Write a protein that binds this DNA or RNA. Structure first.
Ligand SMILES: Nc1ccn([C@H]2C[C@H](O)[C@@H](COP(=O)(O)OP(=O)(O)OP(=O)(O)O)O2)c(=O)n1
Ligand SMILES: [Mg+2]
Ligand SMILES: [Mg+2]
Ligand code: NA
Ligand code: NA
Length: 326
DNA sequence: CCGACGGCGCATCAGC
DNA sequence: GCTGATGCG
DNA sequence: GTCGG
């Protein structure tokens, strides 16, 4: 937490580029710098020291320099004052509303939570449930609640079929003391890269979790990616738990290790690892790792039987989930 | 300087 | 109905 | 915005 003020400034910068400028690479630049400073185990005394790290360049060096002197970034000071940017930023915190929708709403005078509620019928479905549970989705989930939710999902999943395996991934598998949401990877032996012997494999799971009133809302749903809302049961007289985001991702069982690498994350660790795969001459997605040769074309999937095997290929010594928290 | 910067599922829309 | 591009997580 | 070539 040594440079919590620095990395925050970079995060506020990155959200602005994504949400206002819609400059997704500047946003990825700032989020990379942010991450590589967050794990740097000294208290950064100057911009020049920060620039030594990969991902901090000159622009970010001047800004760290300004921030260390005054305790602020004048560029950020004005971005806070700007009415329209402040509004676009705010509406993006609603699930299902990205930078384009946040700008389109602001050009209609829709700038606040009241305006959203008042104009609910101008929201698609995901954005309706996003706004419904706006405050809840702002809360983090203590790991203790993540452990309760895990019991339910896994025990309902094996009521459906003892052959399902469900693995909780995301920050939970990385050992986080609290989680933004719950991320569940699902495998059944019928669904492989070879064949879909069984239909509606994900639907059966979603149905059961709805029947026991765990899943309460759906943001989106197809054959391999469910995205909705869930809520722990509360005791008699207890106040209710907040509603929680839940994502469920069904992966061909023979492709489990590429799946659990992807879903365990983080997004940035994934991005560094896949970038460095390209530099090694490979591509990794959630399903496969493959070579690219001569052309710009993926070859055939290399064999994988462990998460480490993926690290071996790109010549990275293996890293525990709790060390993949970039 | 300049191209690359990770990758893909689902919802929605435009254009047939 | 499609397919393809774009928004969003 | 930053990197590699
Ligand atoms: N742009 C992204 C977003 C997500 N993921 C990945 C890796 C993640 O770890 C996982 C789950 O996504 P989350 O949004 O749940 O991210 P985390 O679980 O890691 O963090 P949080 O605790 O906020 O949920 O999918 C990715 O690869 N690229
Ligand atoms: Mg999560
Ligand atoms: Mg998620
Ligand atoms: Na560097
Ligand atoms: Na949003």
């Amino acid at each position: 937490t040594l440079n919590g003020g620095i990395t925050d400034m970079l995060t506020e910068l990155a959200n602005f580029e994504k949400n206002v400028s819609q400059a997704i690479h500047k946003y990825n630049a700032y989020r990379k710098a942010a991450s590589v400073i967050a794990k740097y185990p000294h208290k950064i005394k100057s911009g020049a020291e920060a620039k030594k790290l990969p991902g901090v360049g000159t622009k970010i060096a001047e800004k760290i320099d300004e921030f260390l002197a005054t305790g602020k970034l004048r560029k950020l000071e004005k971005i806070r004052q700007d009415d329209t940017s402040s509004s676009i930023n705010f509406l993006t915190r609603v699930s299902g509303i990205g930078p384009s929708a946040a700008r389109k709403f602001v050009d209609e005078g829709i700038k606040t939570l009241e305006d959203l509620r008042k104009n609910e019928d101008k929201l698609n479905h995901h954005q309706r449930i996003g706004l419904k549970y706006f405050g809840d989705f702002e809360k983090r989930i203590p790991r203790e609640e993540m452990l309760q939710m895990q019991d339910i999902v896994l025990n309902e999943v094996k009521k459906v079929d003892s052959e399902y395996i469900a693995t909780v991934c995301g920050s939970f598998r990385r050992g986080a003391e609290s989680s933004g949401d719950m991320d569940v990877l699902l495998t059944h032996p019928s669904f492989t890269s070879e064949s879909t012997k069984q239909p509606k494999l994900l639907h059966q799971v979603v149905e059961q979790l709805q029947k026991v009133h765990f899943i309460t809302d759906t943001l989106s749903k197809g054959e391999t990616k469910f995205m909705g809302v869930c809520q722990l049961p509360s005791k008699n007289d207890e106040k209710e738990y907040p509603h929680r985001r839940i994502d469920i991702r069904l992966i061909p069982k023979d492709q489990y290790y590429c799946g659990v690498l992807y879903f365990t994350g983080s997004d940035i660790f994934n991005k560094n690892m896949r970038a460095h795969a390209l530099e090694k001459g490979f591509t990794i997605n959630e399903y496969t790792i493959r070579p690219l040769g001569v052309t710009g074309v993926a070859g055939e999937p290399l064999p994988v039987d462990s998460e480490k095997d993926i690290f071996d290929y790109i010549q990275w010594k293996y890293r525990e989930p709790k060390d993949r928290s970039e």
